[PDB]
Subunit: 151 residues, 7 copies
């Protein structure tokens, strides 16, 4: 019963975090000396908020399914977390590949952005597993409720 | 009940915004000194309106499902928003990669187009989450109506 | 009731437009000085008619579903429009990438073909949204008919 | 009732056309001066017959579904035509990209093969839309028969 | 009734043909002067037998479905043939691309292997369409049996 | 009955292992002399934990399905293991390709990270097959219970 | 009835074979003079065991479906074999492409690893078709049992 309010709050945390990420990216892109670096940090910030919106949408999808079937919601949440993790790995590999292809003069700035981007990946991964763990935590109660019902 | 009219209006905002985006792109491509830049800004404008049409189609798909099942519509809207966000990230990465590969002489103009394109991504992302938030806002009423019905 | 005849006419417009596009492409490829340019304009014309046939097939698929369920037809039409828009963006990005990779001597001719190709993309996009808008316009009547039926 | 015989004949036209295409490709590859050109024309001929077999298989799939549901057959035929068109565009883009990457000495021969390949694409596209138009032509009779049945 | 025995025999022809293909590839790779050529001919032979096994598996899948529904088996066989043709085109394009990228000294040997590989593609394509034609040939009897049953 | 507790413990092992992997990666990235190497080891550590989270999510998905159908859970677990193995191979090939493309000066450090990454792949593969073997081990009991039930 | 025990034994053969493959790969990577070669042989061994685990999982999936429907199990086994063959071809093409891109000094060692990898592909292909042939062999008994039942 308390899941649905938790899911709404979790989306607020994600949306607020995404606003901070783009604010920081805009600050770095405000006066970056390299136009190529300006696009890179802007794309990294745009990629970060895009996956954050996808994570919020995935959480909302699980919440929508929670009102009909709890077993299906857990499966849907697990599928959404796996899809989010795979997409997060996709952008990390592209960012790492771009950083390796960057020139040594710009690679110093690109690696710092890559480290900041890696922090965003870690924050997204930590939030996803924590939300998934809480989501499956109620499944313990859902299965226990079924066990109590048959008693 | 007020969702369906809201969805129709939201499509009008998207279509009107897409017309402005292509109008601005046509102005920049009207007399651009570099033929390669002409294709780049035209493709960026064509990409922007293409995703805008996809976002409008995704909103209409959720509206169509809203007339049958509200829970399915919310799931469909969340899936459409995630698909739109993933596609938006795809074009942003391609645009950023092209900007990094652009020559320094053209990179100054390419980065300005990239910044304009990034603004379109931000506008699309902001509109998608706002529309999704309003769409799930009625789900609060939909669940409350079910709770009131069982009372 | 008037949708099905409209869909048949819309396919005739698309097929007639595709014939004009390939006729113009054949005229440019008839005596182009560069063999590489000959393949490029021919491929661009072949790509344009291919998506036009796909758009006509997508419209026919919606018309076929219109005879069974109107809600499903609108969803299918929206899905087909999104798929057509995504495919149209795919060829535009490839054409833009090829134009940027073209040599400066040929880039002048390639950019003109790219601009012509961009016009085909705009014509296809404008036709798709107009057809989709008319298709969902009947959904207003379909929902109104259901509302009148329950009265 | 006359569709099924038409589909069988249409496959015979496609198979006979594919035999002519590979016969012409074998003639050009019989004594081509460039071993790279020999592989290119052979692959182009192999690609042409491969899609021709796929088009024949797609037509047979629609014929198989025609014996159970006419509405499903039209949808399946439209889906098969779209898939064939997308695959045809895929090989055209690859052939065009290879032609642009060919050396100027071989590009003269490669462009002639590209033009011949483009003719095969046009023949396949024209046959697919003509077969699809005939397939949906019976849908007019199928819907009219249902209208006559309810009268 | 005679289909199932035919399918078993057809797999035996494919497996026997695959053994001959790898035997010939092993003979060429036994004493090839170029280590790069050794990997290329081995991969081409490995690719040929891999698709041959896939074709045999696709034929067995149609045979398995033949014991339950004949209409579904024909659709499954058509889908398997299309998938096999698409995969066969995929390896042909990769082999052709590798041959074009081969050095002129090795391209003479690579083109001969490409021609041998093209023969394997033709043999696989000819066998697939012949097996599919026989498979749909019984569909004529299956539909005729239904027509005779209703008489 | 003891599966569900085993699945919860297995996730704890995976999450604890992932924390150790990122801790080791952070130690190597804390003072790496090459900024490109810093991104590479960070991406490798981020990739390792991402697949570990996916493996934990896949295990939880099988546990969720275990409460409804045991046969479906085994199929879902097998599908999840195959998907995890395919994704693990994807990152291994990318890491191996990047290591081969690394310069000889950095390749010495890159190969050591590749060997460490290969150990993570082996640990993930060993854990996945061991968890799958235990999961199918209960299927022996599930089938035996059905056999005992019919007795 | 004897299939299920055969499937369990077949997995034991695959797992034991995979252990031998990685043991041999570890021996070659223990003292390889080239760090790039060390990653290549390790990745090839990791790829080999990964597909072996996938093949074992595919066999277990067919065994799980064998307890419910024999016709579905044969279709699932055929689909799994086709997927395994396609994935096996994917790694073979990547390995062959990497071998061709290897420098001549390392290509001698890379080709030997490629030949060893090709042997693993042949062993996997031979085991898959043999297991599939045995799996469909019981389908002969399954269909014969149905024929005997109706007698």
């Amino acid at each position: 019963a308390e899941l649905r309010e938790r899911l709404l709050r979790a989306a607020r945390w994600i949306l607020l975090l995404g606003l901070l990420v783009l604010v920081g990216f805009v600050v770095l892109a405000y006066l970056e000396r390299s136009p190529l670096i300006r696009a890179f940090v802007l794309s990294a910030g745009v990629v970060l908020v895009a996956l954050f919106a996808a994570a919020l949408a995935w959480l909302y999808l699980a919440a929508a399914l929670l009102g009909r079937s709890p077993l299906l919601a857990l499966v849907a949440l697990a599928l959404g977390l796996i899809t989010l993790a795979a997409a997060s790995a996709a952008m990390a590999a592209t960012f790492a590949h771009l950083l390796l292809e960057a020139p040594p003069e710009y690679r110093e700035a690109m690696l710092y952005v890559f480290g900041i981007a890696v922090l965003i990946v870690g924050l997204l991964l930590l939030g996803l597993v924590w939300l998934l763990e809480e989501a499956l935590e109620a499944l313990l109660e859902e299965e226990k409720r079924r066990e109590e019902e048959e008693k």
